[PDB]
Amino acid sequence: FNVAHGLAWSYYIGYLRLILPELQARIRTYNQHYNNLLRGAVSQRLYILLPLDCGVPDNLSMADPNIRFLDKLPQQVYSNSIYELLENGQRAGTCVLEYATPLQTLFAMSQYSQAGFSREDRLEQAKLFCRTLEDILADAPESQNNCRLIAYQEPAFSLSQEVLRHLRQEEKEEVTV
Amino acid sequence: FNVAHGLAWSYYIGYLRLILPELQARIRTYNQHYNNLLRGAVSQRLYILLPLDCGVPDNLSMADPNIRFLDKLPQQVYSNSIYELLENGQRAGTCVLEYATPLQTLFAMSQYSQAGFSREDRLEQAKLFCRTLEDILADAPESQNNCRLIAYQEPAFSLSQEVLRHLRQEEKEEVTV
Ligand SMILES: C=CC[C@H]1COc2cc(C(N)=O)cc3nc(NC(=O)c4cc(C)nn4CC)n1c23
Ligand SMILES: C=CC[C@H]1COc2cc(C(N)=O)cc3nc(NC(=O)c4cc(C)nn4CC)n1c23
Ligand SMILES: [Ca+2]
Ligand SMILES: [Ca+2]
């Protein structure tokens, strides 16, 4: 009994597979402007945050003040937000970012006593979710190429620096291959 | 590997558990009017349709012309629709009705070739979903008492008559206990 299996398949089939194809176009269009305006470029991939502690805040800035909402991505109804990543008060990147909502379900199950679902169980299933979703996106037609999973365990950490590491690696890959 | 486990837990934790508590109040309020007006009474339970063939139409009337949209249930934002059930053109009942959306995910997986998910697999998981969701609602605090699962296999059938059978049984139970 592993709720993570079905959560990952549902998150892909009922959301990712539907949004990613429109996403690529929406981002190119936005980038025409963003370029001419802020001489910036928004990454073409959806960045999905996977905190293994299953903590999804109501606003990204609360999880890290260097992640600041910039703009909503326009439609060609799906809502998506562009964020800027700061270093020393200066802009270091911009991207479409959001948390994997299924993890909220895992968190809630660990607080629902009838479930018998411990924090240990929650962490094990959060990792299994990440692994399963990765497998799915690896086999998926083009859709996978439109996003990147960012899974991280916080110690007992700079989320913005983690996102920037991926964004800089993505740019490196783009120009080299 | 059973996606039905996680689908049922997600459907409960991320939708049912959140809507049912408001539901009871919304329905009582509506029933004040519906009574004074059409001398009718809307059942206090959410009826969830579970076609085992995982066929979810865009409109109920297309699945059965004797199921006719009557009104949207008001808010105390969650959208819910009240339907009337017809017999010989005459109204035989009214209730809040909707399909279990997770089944759409099962249908889509059976059409997604990379999944290796056959129709046999789809039916097995649709039944497992129904059984798991039933177990959850049986152990759930009060929430279960606000809805009823209607699972049915169509031959190779009157959906409105199936819903009415449940509505009439619910009324019988209400007055006797
Ligand atoms: C029922 C339809 C909701 C779908 C489609 O519309 C959506 C729009 C936006 C947006 N940013 O505007 C986000 C979003 N997120 C989900 N759904 C899951 O995240 C999810 C988690 C699990 C587990 N399974 N699912 C798919 C049902 N949806 C959506
Ligand atoms: C992401 C948030 C969407 C939530 C909350 O808002 C909703 C409102 C209405 C309405 N009638 O107005 C229907 C509905 N249906 C789902 N969600 C699933 O049906 C579902 C299937 C599986 C599997 N897991 N989930 C929960 C995410 N939601 C909602
Ligand atoms: Ca955290
Ligand atoms: Ca059918």
Numbering used by the authors:
A (entry chain A), B (entry chain A): 153 to 228, 239 to 318, 323 to 343
What does the original paper state about this entry?
We initially obtained a crystal structure of compound 2 in complex with human STING. Although the complex was crystallized in C2221 space group with a single molecule per asymmetric unit, analysis of the buried surface area and complementarity between two symmetry related molecules suggested that this assembly likely represented a biologically relevant dimer. The structure revealed two molecules of compound 2 bound in the cGAMP binding pocket per STING dimer that are in proximity and raised the possibility that covalently linking two such monomers might produce dimeric compounds with higher potency as previously observed. We have discovered a novel series of non-CDN small molecule STING agonists with fused tricyclic core via structure-based drug design (SBDD).
Stimulator of interferon genes (STING) is a transmembrane protein located in the endoplasmic reticulum (ER). The activated cGAS converts GTP and ATP into 2ʹ, 3ʹ-cyclic guanosine monophosphate–adenosine monophosphate (cGAMP), which binds to STING, leading to its conformational changes and trafficking from the endoplasmic reticulum (ER) to the Golgi to perinuclear endosomes. Consequently, STING recruits tank-binding kinase 1 (TBK1), which phosphorylates IFN regulatory factor 3 (IRF3), leading to its translocation into the nucleus to drive the transcriptional induction of type I interferons and the nuclear factor-κB (NF-κB)-dependent expression of proinflammatory cytokines. Based on our molecular modeling analysis, along with the reported CDN-STING crystal structures, we designed a novel series of fused tricyclic heterocycle compounds and analyzed their binding to human STING with thermal shift assays and the potency in activation of STING signaling with a reporter cellular assay.
